Structure 1
Amino acid sequence: STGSATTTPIDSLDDAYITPVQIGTPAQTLNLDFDTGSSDLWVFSSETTASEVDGQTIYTPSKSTTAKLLSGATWSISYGDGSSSSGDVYTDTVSVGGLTVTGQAVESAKKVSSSFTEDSTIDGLLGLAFSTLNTVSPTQQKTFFDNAKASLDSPVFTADLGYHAPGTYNFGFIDTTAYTGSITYTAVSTKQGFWEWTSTGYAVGSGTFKSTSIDGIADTGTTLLYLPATVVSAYWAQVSGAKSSSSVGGYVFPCSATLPSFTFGVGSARIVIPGDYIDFGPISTGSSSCFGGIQSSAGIGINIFGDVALKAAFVVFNGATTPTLGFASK
């Protein structure tokens, strides 16, 4: 089997991407944030504290003839950005782009933090990291991909995120028309539960490539590119007037600037992030100070190849017995 679904930016900055997901019988379609940095599939629901729902579409398990309470199971998650959610668990039928899993754990939110409430466009998350990170207790549950894997034509999914445009998540096949050149594959460590890999270096603009190992995670649920302070300083030093602002919470730059590209290495291959992808617009409405898309990972504890990086590539998440990651230009 295979599946193919379009993923769409939630706003004009590509702050996140939503993908429609069918849950239950008859189908209830919710728009979920596919997150390769976590492993829970959770949704706004009829159980979510009413004051914490503001415009989201909710899953109502009582209206699904295939929903079953997973007795005694609870979940609770906290994300890198400080947001969180928790609740109980149902199993139900879940379909993505024509690919159907029966008995998928659907984690129903009883509580969500303010950032989730305040984002009316995201109805929940669909985790695509390794199932060892799943938070369901006392019986850990499998991700949608993990459940689908044996049925897939090939044990892979691909992320093809757009810049200010829709893109695609495919399951079970590699669309050879979706990228240019060849796909370069690179080793993955699953030791921390992430799609963790090592970039071979970077360049700023038309500058020379610096060979240096940068360990980080491929994370579709993180907006920006978070890299070591040395790398980030070298990037922003090429932008007149750019500076790190503690008050704003990162590097900012004059909105009048033309940003240089940023290249990262994948083995001997190179992925080029155009300068425009690094612009996250005014820090506040009407400001001429703009927020940068490359930020320091210092004090996160890990480097994160988030959407800024991933949307410059066609990315293969290869869930074979020994997982690997592939990157192609597009």
Structure 2
Amino acid sequence: AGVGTVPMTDYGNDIEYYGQVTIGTPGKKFNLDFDTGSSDLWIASTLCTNCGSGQTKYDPNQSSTYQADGRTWSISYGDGSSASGILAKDNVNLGGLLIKGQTIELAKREAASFASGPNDGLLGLGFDTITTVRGVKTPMDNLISQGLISRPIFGVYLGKAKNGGGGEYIFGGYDSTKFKGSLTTVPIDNSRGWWGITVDRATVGTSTVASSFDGILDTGTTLLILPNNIAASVARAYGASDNGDGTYTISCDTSAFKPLVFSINGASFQVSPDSLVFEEFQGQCIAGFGYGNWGFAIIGDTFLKNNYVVFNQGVPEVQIAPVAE
């Protein structure tokens, strides 16, 4: 694997994607979820009292480069999960790039969904205006300032379980084998600390199911979550039925569905028919799109496993192109 190249592991039916990170000296490998919707780097530690027995835990005592920090932290994600603990400092090796002196957040407590998932913690890739502790420099901030990347970018390829899973993150570069055509440049709004974009319209066949709306590119959100009127409008196009819990029940037979097409900055990006079905349970299928009571959409893995994204922290802007498949 090339410099700053991190091969990802697809968990379940495109639930999430994690990669290995080496923390400490001599260091241990941690499977972290790469999240563009958050900016805190936290990991399960031996200070943890409700952590999974399966999780790999960071042990201060076994890293000769650990440095104590008197600050505490606590986070609350949008799916109701959380974690809390203490700050510390150590070295993080991301794809061969050794970030020296990264602020790592060691978990003392964590939600049970963390304890039972595949992750040892999270790597956040949002802007630093949203770190939970003021003054923390995120890993991207550090790669740039330590000169480990020459371009303030990361290229993201998320695979489809249907095709073998996988995925790959490249810090300071991108891979044109993973996409097709020309990249489209889309300006980013980071005023709320996220990768915000504007979708000009959404169509299904010849029907305009939605006009322009804002969304955030979130690699760490499984589905495409839309504001209530938009979701409703999309579901009507597919005969999906509201399960009343932010999810829809859709036909398992996607063969007749037309793709959901997003018009972003003049180009067409889609959610292929197959991605319209998230999961099949005892012959009932959950749709790849859901609803939330937000004015903005959460453009999650349903969309990202269909379109390659180059994230530029410097401008900021993104470059999108249809995945090559």
Contact map agreement 2:246 2:291 (CA 8 A) in 1:
no
Residue 9 in structure 1 maps to residue 6 in structure 2: no
Deviation at 1:78, TM superposition (A): 0.2
Any idea what the Cα deviations from partners look like across 1:116-162, whole Å, max 9, x if unmatched? 1121x1110000001111112xx531111111023112111121111
Is 1:126 matched with 2:109? no
TM-score, normalization: structure 1? 0.90
Aligned residues, how many? 316
Q: 2:289 aligns with which of 271, 288, 294?
A: 294
Given that residues 271 and 328 in structure 1 are in contact (C-alpha distance below 8 angstroms), is that contact kept between their aligned partners in structure 2? yes
Q: What is the aligned partner in structure 2 of residue 147 from structure 1?
A: 142
Contact 1:243 1:251 in 2 (8 A): yes
Q: Does the Cα contact within 8 Å between 1:2 and 1:153 map onto a contact in 2?
A: no
1:326 is aligned to 319
Deviates most, 161-170 or 206-215: 206-215
Higher mean alpha-carbon deviation, 126-135 vs 226-235, is at 226-235
Deviation at 1:255, TM superposition (A): 3.1
Compute the RMSD of aligned alpha carbons.
1.8
Q: Distance in 1 between matches of 2:28 and 2:15?
A: 25
Is the alpha carbon distance of 1:175 and 1:304 closer, same or farther for their aligned partners in structure 2, counting shifts above 3 Å? same
Shift of 1:303: 1.2
Number of the residue aligned with 1:265: 263
Instruction: Compute the displacement of 1:239 (Å).
Output: 3.0
Give, in whole Å, the separation in 1 of the partners of 2:201 and 2:140. Answer: 30
Distance 2:184 2:174 in 1: 13
- Quick one: which of 274, 293, 299 aligns to 1:305? 299
Aligned to 1:158: 155
- Post-superposition Cα deviations, 1:293-328, rounded to whole Å, max 9, x if no partner, equal 11123x1343110111111111011111x3111111
The farther-off stretch of 122-131 and 255-264 is 255-264
Q: TM-score, normalised by structure 2?
A: 0.92
Provide the rounded CA distance (Å) in 1 between the counterparts of 2:206 and 2:125.
35
* Long gaps (5+) in structure 1: none
Q: 3-state DSSP class of the match of 1:126? A: strand
Paired position in structure 1 for 2:56: 57
Please state how far the C-alpha of 1:46 moved relative to its aligned partner.
0.8
CA contact (8 A) 2:210 2:233 kept: no
SS of the counterpart of 2:211?
A: strand
2: CA distance, partners of 1:253 / 1:300: 23
Which 5+ residue runs of structure 2 have no aligned equivalent? none
Q: Distance in 1 between matches of 2:272 and 2:297?
A: 20
The aligned counterpart of 2:187 is 187
State the Cα deviation string for residues 155-211 of structure 1 (Å, max 9, x = none): 11121111111011111112233321111111111111101111111122x335567
Output the CA distance in 1 between the equivalents of 2:23 and 2:241: 46
Whole-Å separation in 1 of the counterparts to 2:25 and 2:131: 25
Write the distance in 2 (CA, Å) between the matches of 1:243 and 1:211.
18
Q: Which deviations, in whole Å up to 9, do the C-alpha atoms of 1:269-292 show, x marking residues without a partner?
A: 11121111121223xx52x32211
Aligned to 1:250: 247
CA contact (8 A) 2:218 2:299 kept: yes
Give the match's secondary structure for 1:192: coil
Matched residue, 2:95: 97
Question: Quick one: distance in 1 between partners of 2:189 and 2:229?
Answer: 24
* Displacement after TM superposition at 1:61 (Å): 1.8
| SS class of match (2:189) | coil
Query: What residue in structure 2 maps to residue 43 of structure 1?
Result: 43
Bigger drift between 223-232 and 182-191 goes to: 223-232
How far did residue 257 of structure 1 move? 5.1
Contact 1:238 1:260 in 2 (8 A): no
In the alignment, the residues of structure 2 paired with residue 229 and residue 301 of structure 1 have an alpha-carbon distance, to the nearest angstrom, of 9
